[PDB]
Design a protein around this motif. Structure first.
Motif, PDB file in Angstrom:
ATOM      1  N   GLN A  62       0.831  -1.195   0.000  1.00 52.78           N
ATOM      2  CA  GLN A  62       0.000   0.000   0.000  1.00 52.78           C
ATOM      3  C   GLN A  62       0.869   1.250   0.000  1.00 52.78           C
ATOM      4  O   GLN A  62       1.892   1.301   0.684  1.00 52.78           O
ATOM      5  CB  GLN A  62      -0.927   0.002   1.219  1.00 52.78           C
ATOM      6  CG  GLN A  62      -1.873   1.208   1.314  1.00 52.78           C
ATOM      7  CD  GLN A  62      -2.937   1.000   2.382  1.00 52.78           C
ATOM      8  OE1 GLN A  62      -3.180  -0.129   2.797  1.00 52.78           O
ATOM      9  NE2 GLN A  62      -3.581   2.085   2.826  1.00 52.78           N
ATOM     10  N   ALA A 100      -7.099   2.059  -1.908  1.00 47.21           N
ATOM     11  CA  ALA A 100      -7.351   1.983  -0.480  1.00 47.21           C
ATOM     12  C   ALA A 100      -8.435   2.993  -0.105  1.00 47.21           C
ATOM     13  O   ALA A 100      -8.687   3.964  -0.822  1.00 47.21           O
ATOM     14  CB  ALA A 100      -6.068   2.261   0.304  1.00 47.21           C
ATOM     15  N   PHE A 112      -3.218   0.310  -3.473  1.00 46.58           N
ATOM     16  CA  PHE A 112      -2.423  -0.864  -3.156  1.00 46.58           C
ATOM     17  C   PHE A 112      -2.261  -1.721  -4.397  1.00 46.58           C
ATOM     18  O   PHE A 112      -3.094  -1.702  -5.308  1.00 46.58           O
ATOM     19  CB  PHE A 112      -3.005  -1.690  -1.978  1.00 46.58           C
ATOM     20  CG  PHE A 112      -4.435  -2.154  -2.164  1.00 46.58           C
ATOM     21  CD1 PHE A 112      -5.494  -1.278  -1.964  1.00 46.58           C
ATOM     22  CD2 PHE A 112      -4.717  -3.481  -2.465  1.00 46.58           C
ATOM     23  CE1 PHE A 112      -6.812  -1.703  -2.095  1.00 46.58           C
ATOM     24  CE2 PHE A 112      -6.037  -3.916  -2.612  1.00 46.58           C
ATOM     25  CZ  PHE A 112      -7.086  -3.021  -2.418  1.00 46.58           C
ATOM     26  N   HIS A 125     -13.497  -2.031  -2.559  1.00 43.01           N
ATOM     27  CA  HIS A 125     -12.404  -1.213  -3.061  1.00 43.01           C
ATOM     28  C   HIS A 125     -12.481  -1.139  -4.577  1.00 43.01           C
ATOM     29  O   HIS A 125     -12.767  -2.136  -5.243  1.00 43.01           O
ATOM     30  CB  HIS A 125     -11.053  -1.774  -2.620  1.00 43.01           C
ATOM     31  CG  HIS A 125     -10.844  -1.693  -1.143  1.00 43.01           C
ATOM     32  ND1 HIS A 125     -10.146  -0.665  -0.545  1.00 43.01           N
ATOM     33  CD2 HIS A 125     -11.299  -2.473  -0.136  1.00 43.01           C
ATOM     34  CE1 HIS A 125     -10.149  -0.840   0.764  1.00 43.01           C
ATOM     35  NE2 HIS A 125     -10.844  -1.926   1.038  1.00 43.01           N
TER      36      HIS A 125
END
Ligand code: NA
Length: 164
Positions: A62, A100, A112, A125
């Motif tokens: 991330q 994210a 990420f 997401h």
């Protein structure tokens, strides 16, 4: 129509290599354009000089919190946050590039790169691209993470930009 962008990444000042990402502007143009512009820095801010602050082996790497460098910050080119564009693209395996967030409609700049299939993130997401080349570099990044997310080295995006 899909941009190709790149991240040049080092660990403790030592280059790891280049990750090349395709951005799915054909499925999520708003989300792709946010990431594209943060790679070029053309709005006067972006990823260059920021870190992979949370790296979990057998999960994901991330990055993108260029304001607080710890997962609490970042901002989009539109403002602090923007809605979930759609959930059409799925977390189908290693190399998926996804936003994210801190819940529904909180996309900023943090993103990420998956190192496994993270299908339980589908519908939560926004996937907006994938690794075209440099998955070995992603695995190098991943090797400096921990199950806690804390990294053993400072992983920095030394440069980034657009290839096409
Ligand atoms: Na787990």
């Amino acid at each position: 129509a899909n941009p190709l962008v790149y991240l040049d990444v080092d660990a403790n000042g030592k280059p790891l290599g280049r990750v090349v990402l395709e951005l799915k502007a054909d499925v999520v143009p708003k989300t792709a354009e946010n990431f594209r512009a943060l790679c070029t820095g053309e709005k006067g801010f972006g990823y260059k000089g920021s870190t992979f602050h949370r790296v979990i082996p057998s999960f994901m790497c991330q990055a993108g919190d260029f304001t607080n460098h710890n997962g609490t910050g970042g901002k989009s080119i539109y403002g602090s946050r923007f809605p979930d564009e759609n959930f059409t693209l799925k977390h189908v395996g290693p190399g998926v590039l996804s936003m994210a967030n801190a819940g529904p409609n909180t996309n900023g700049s943090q993103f990420f790169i998956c190192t496994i299939k993270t299908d339980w993130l589908d519908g939560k997401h926004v996937v907006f691209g994938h690794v075209i080349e440099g998955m070995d570099v992603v695995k190098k990044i991943e090797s400096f993470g921990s199950k806690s997310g804390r990294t053993s080295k400072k992983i920095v995006i030394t440069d980034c930009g657009q290839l096409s």
